[PDB]
Model the fold of this input.
Amino acid sequence: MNINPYFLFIDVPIQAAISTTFPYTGVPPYSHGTGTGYTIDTVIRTHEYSNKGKQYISDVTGCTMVDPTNGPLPEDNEPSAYAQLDCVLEALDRMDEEHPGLFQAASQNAMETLMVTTVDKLTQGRQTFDWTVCRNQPAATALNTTITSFRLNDLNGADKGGLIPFCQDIIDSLDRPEMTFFSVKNIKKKLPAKNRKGFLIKRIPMKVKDKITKVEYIKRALSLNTMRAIATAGIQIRGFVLVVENLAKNICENLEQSGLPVGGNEKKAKLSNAVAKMLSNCPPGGISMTVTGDNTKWNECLNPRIFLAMTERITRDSPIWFRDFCSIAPVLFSNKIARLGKGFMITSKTKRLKAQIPCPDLFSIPLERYNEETRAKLKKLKPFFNEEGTASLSPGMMMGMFNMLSTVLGVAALGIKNIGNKEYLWDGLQSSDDFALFVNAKDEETCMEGINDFYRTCKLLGINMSKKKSYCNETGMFEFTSMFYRDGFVSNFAMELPSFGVAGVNESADMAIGMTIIKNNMINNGMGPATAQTAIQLFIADYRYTYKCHRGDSKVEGKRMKIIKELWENTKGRDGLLVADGGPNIYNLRNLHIPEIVLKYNLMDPEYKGRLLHPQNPFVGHDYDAVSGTHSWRTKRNRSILNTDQRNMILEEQCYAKCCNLFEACFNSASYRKPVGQHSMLEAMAHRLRMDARLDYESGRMSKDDFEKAMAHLGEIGYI
Amino acid sequence: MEMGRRIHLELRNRTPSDVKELVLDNSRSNEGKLEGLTDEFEELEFLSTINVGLTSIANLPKLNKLKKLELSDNRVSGGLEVLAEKCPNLTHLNLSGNKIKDLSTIEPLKKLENLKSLDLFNCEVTNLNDYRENVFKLLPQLTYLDGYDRDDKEA
Amino acid sequence: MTLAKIELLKQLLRDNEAKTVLKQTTVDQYNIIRKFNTSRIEKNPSLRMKWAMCSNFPLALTKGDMANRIPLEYKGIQLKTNAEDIGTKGQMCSIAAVTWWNTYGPIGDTEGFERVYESFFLRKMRLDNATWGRITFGPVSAEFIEMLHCLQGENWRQIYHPGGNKLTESRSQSMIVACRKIIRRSIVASNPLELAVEIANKTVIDTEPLKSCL
Amino acid sequence: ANMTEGKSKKPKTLAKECLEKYSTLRDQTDPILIMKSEKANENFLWKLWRDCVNTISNEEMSNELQKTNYAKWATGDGLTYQKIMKEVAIDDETMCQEEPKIPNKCRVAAWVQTEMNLLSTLTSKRALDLPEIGPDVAPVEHVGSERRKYFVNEINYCKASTVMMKYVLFHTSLLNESNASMGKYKVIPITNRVVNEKGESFDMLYGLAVKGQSHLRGDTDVVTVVTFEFSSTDPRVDSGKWPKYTVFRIGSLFVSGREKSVYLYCRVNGTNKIQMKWGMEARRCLLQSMQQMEAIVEQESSIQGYDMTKACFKGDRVNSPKTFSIGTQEGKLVKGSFGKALRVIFTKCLMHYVFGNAQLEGFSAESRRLLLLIQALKDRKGPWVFDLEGMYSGIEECISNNPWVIQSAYWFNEWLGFEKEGSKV
Amino acid sequence: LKQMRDQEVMKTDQFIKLLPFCFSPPKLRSNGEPYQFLKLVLKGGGENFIEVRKGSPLFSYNPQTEVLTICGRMMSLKGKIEDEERNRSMGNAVLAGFLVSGKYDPDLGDFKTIEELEKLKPGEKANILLYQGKPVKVVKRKR
Amino acid sequence: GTTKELVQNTYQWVLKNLVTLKAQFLLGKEDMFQWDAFEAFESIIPQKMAGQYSGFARAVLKQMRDQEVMKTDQFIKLLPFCFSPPKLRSNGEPYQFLKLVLKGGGENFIEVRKGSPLFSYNPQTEVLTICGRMMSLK
Done:
């Protein structure tokens, strides 16, 4: 009997059968390498779909620029980035007329939020491209480095605290003839280390001051570095994109078509409501069709100039300063420069050699030495390449940075609802990459005529529908963002599942975080009761393994398990003991939002309650919900190097190695005989030698003459 | 070496009805048969045929006393129903290393009722879901198999 | 030899730099250089704590009478360390120490604890006084959002009602549910009459038979 | 197998005891080579295995190899190219970029069908022991508990569960060994803890594996590990199944008084820390399969207004035990209980996780659209396609060399043929 | 229970532990011999298991104080325990058709799993383990 | 030495001087069975039962000499066990066995019928695997 798993589809609808095909909503490790080649291909494709536009030379950054907007309309079904401004303006006009007082209110709310916001908001983000060092650093570190450089350059926006002064100082820094900043430089090492020679070589960083001309800083600020996001943007762009996205979110929240920022069962409600609404107003005897459309090269076709036009149209009645503030982001994106990453690698098999060619030296060697695909890619990329290992890139959107504005543009495309006053009405939903289109007509022929008209219209707006990944069927069954809807039933394609291990804070905190994660997964991603209970079981298993807190009545052995077993033997209320103390777990679906301390309080032993919740215990000392007890301990978090200046100047003197060598013998002869606790190493040596001489004389290793000689020398030391 | 040489060595040039067992191993056969064993045989208990290149079971004396038979490392692939008409008194069956395609090949053993142990190792039929259960409900007379019916005993 | 080390130390003291570094840098500072010399930071917090727990003294400890109350050793198991630490500027304690505190530690007074964390106790009380109903599958309020994980799903709905200080009809509120269970036990079993009467006769609401309450 | 009371012991001691029980295999010094890889050297692998067993059988607590010679020379760790300054490469004319080794194209592999068939069978041992949960009160909790009971009862002893547990445990041990030992070779036994119906628990040893050094601190950097796993299957039967393995013959075991050979499949492999994390997370196949089964049950209940768990598993008075079309027997459809469907789902999820590469995920993502269109066709919804050949090209772009992808394509073709021939009725 | 009754090794702990399981109709093997087990699992999995030899969280016995522990609750069995009960410690009430005859003899070999016990033949002696550090030697019996 | 080592050495001593034992076998005298080499072998057989093994081996070897022809592998396997004096049944017949257990139990066992982890001779190629080591007998 040869199994055939696909045969399940015979007895089960495919929508349910393929539920949760991918356990991971993130990124796999085996995805096609996103290196210099991938970014080169991305820029090549971005410039390829817009090569019929206007090509010119930027007078600021001196880089090639391509502008496809208002360019010739496509004559082929291939992707096109030529979005006419008039069509976009008309679509925005239609949206505004349909929703009176929407753009004004959204712009007002966005500007008020910007006025009340603070620079600290910029720290909530993923890896950010720091320009001072030209790398990827955490948001907080990047913001701190930018602030320090601004202070060095007589720019103190962060001092005022507001975000508006910070962005004003950013755009002012874009005007300084020379920009001075701090940078980190690594220098080799010569300090001792015991492997076989008491000598090792490493890298130590130091802070230095570096200055850059105006054009260099201008190019650096617009740079987009690469680490399914393809690149990250520095700090000079973060505030403006934040404001523009807040505006777009304010607009979208009141757009019934927008599929964002819906999350949870609200998504299912929106899907079913849209289907029901479209079916209700279907013409008597007409036909309703549904397209699960997808967009190819979504972010490689949208143009920053079109986003600038959308921002200008939306904020047509708003203070001029806010209009400029909103416009600062699209103009920055329209001049974005991509960084190609590390570079390539070329090898010689005959001599068994290999080397890494960095981006600036990409063209330093004949193209014949690159494989076919890289040769062609470099040949095509030559015009859009800079001498500093960067590529000019005017068009494109390099994945998600204006997702809300993309959704707004898609909703505008969906809001036309008719072309030529034909016998079809279209509508649907769209969330920043994917759209579901519902069209009502008389016969399927007119429905497909309407679908064709919608395809042409979105082409006019620069949105390219995917013919190779889209299909149409009678309304009632479709998909929308990995969520299959079928005549009321709803299923998910990919659902994130709890990862192995505890959260990584502490016993009570880890338990609370795990339970709240399970609860959130149930609420949002739609995890069934049995799956949630199994997740609880797995989390308990992992927690017990990590904290070595198996059941008190178990037969396992461990350093902590002996005390756990003794406590279990001495305790009467064994149902009230916490899991961390080998007690029984009692968590279930109905009580996934209650801390275990509160759950078990009524069953705890009063003596155990006092010991556990002692107001002054030595462990606690000085989101999720838990109880502050003896299980809220803190782990030692102290590493790296402090006292950097003193340590560096000491290590750079000379005699440190001799001190280490003298220390090593005596204080390694025994595993631990160090009077540690801030004792000066000289004092510890004096005490150690005094004790060694005492022991030598007592055992007879030394005569009285050597004894007295040693005590005189030690007398000169000062600790005797 | 040939089946005849093995027959002569085992019988030592005596009457056919003098040995209740045979060892036909490492013997070349004409087109994959078991010649050299005449139908005159009347008493036989144990059999052993390994590396004989037997491709089919169509030549075998009619018998009523054999209880064990051993076939291995052969490309035989065909119905075994003929065993019922030739000797429906088998108790130990060994097909380890044989070449059987699907479950249908072992079907004709249903009509035999005295079989208690059947062996099928590294057989193309052995790599299937519920092959153990499917064979069991297909041959109710079977009391043993590759060795793990319910316990472990030795032949 | 003590004399050899002594003479070498004197010779080293002849130089100013060695004398200065030995006078200022402490034994605690000596460990720091070796760390960065051959150690650095790691990632993957889930595994980080897994490694940390297996160590001897991963837990920070406060300084005070309570900290010194727990012993250094217990049945051949170490708990904490005497020498001061660098980072925490205090003692460090082993994981087992916590368990020791939960077993033989001083017994404090927890009076008024419910008041401090009253919200969680209110949530637990509301959950306890729930009256769960039916569960209905697909078609084909401040106190309600908190439990939403157990009320509504993609293709199912749980009928749940809240509670809170609804005391007064205690006895009644008891008998009904008890009686309900009896029926639930009798309907499934064949000939429910005798079994139902048997269970009803042998049930007591904590002091008295169900018959008297009914 | 080595029956134990149930105590937890270090892997080194467990491997030592397991080899002591099967002393004959441990003391094997003359290898009877049976098959060889195209590039690997049999002598080096055998000497490395001998060093590994010597280290396992010694007395020192550490599991660290001391004869680094054969370990270093066997995994090709000395053949890595030396990096030179970029300036020399620019000046040099013989240093040129190498073409990408695109995956080859392969036909249907018959061993994937056997893998799926066998991993879905019920063995005599189980390797799952999950903790307890609080008492169930709400009806939803009761439904979930019943579903969990049925699921675990069905797939407790399934061989797929044991294989998954071995995989996750081995990857967890590999990740742990990389804690502080990065510049040294570490021997790691491929062990497992198993429990049978009678209740007695065994500690199985499936072989050893020596992990090399990763001087670079990066987490996405391959650290070569060579694994020697025991087996009872002669590779000569399916020569095409093992073009990448080096196999010896160590000895022979006795189970029912009968001698069965034992081969040692030795293979070099390369994986990074992120791959260790992926292997550790590979336990998510349990939740994945449970979610799939729960979606099936939820759909069945949504047809009605009440839960359909017990009815679709055991059957009530009104309903009948639901049966699923499992596979094919002599070219004819065959049905089976919901338990078999659950086991097949679990095996499919486990194989998807194990055989996962970019090709597999892309193929699944596009077969999603193809399957949805087929479903729309089934429900008489009159589907329309704009560029069908575009979808077909997108799907076929991923069928190059992955065994799972190729077998999935074969099964999809078979099922599509069955649907076509069954839709005419 | 029948084996315990026939040859007087009546042990209160084993009797109490194994009495409830005797309801269901017997299901013997094709050989006509009763199955063998090490621990009997109950519904709910995990902790819900009764150990046939040493003790389980659901059932444990302390003969030093003669205390019975059921699901974490402790009781005293004074008056229900015979003086000679302790001497016949455990080995005569852990397997069907097996009785104690000696002590740990490394020469006979290591402990034998239930798989080998079930396939054993009468008159053959084997070794078993009750719990860590308390092995015993038993012999099969026809009765 | 370990039990496996003792079995290996005893069987190797038997194999090397095969001519002497095979010649003494035809005569049919107890002198050949009372060799010094088997004394150490006597240490690796259970004392309570070694005599039964010796009696059974002696009986089977006598039957071999009487009512059949040469069979080297079985003679090899059954020779070493006869050093200890026998313990015949009460009636006077020899005890019958098919699995000779050895010190250490478990794997340390010889199989009378075909072979075991310590001893297994395949005639198809005439190769004798002893304690995980193959000798040739051609």
Summary: The longest strand of chain D covers residues 259-271.
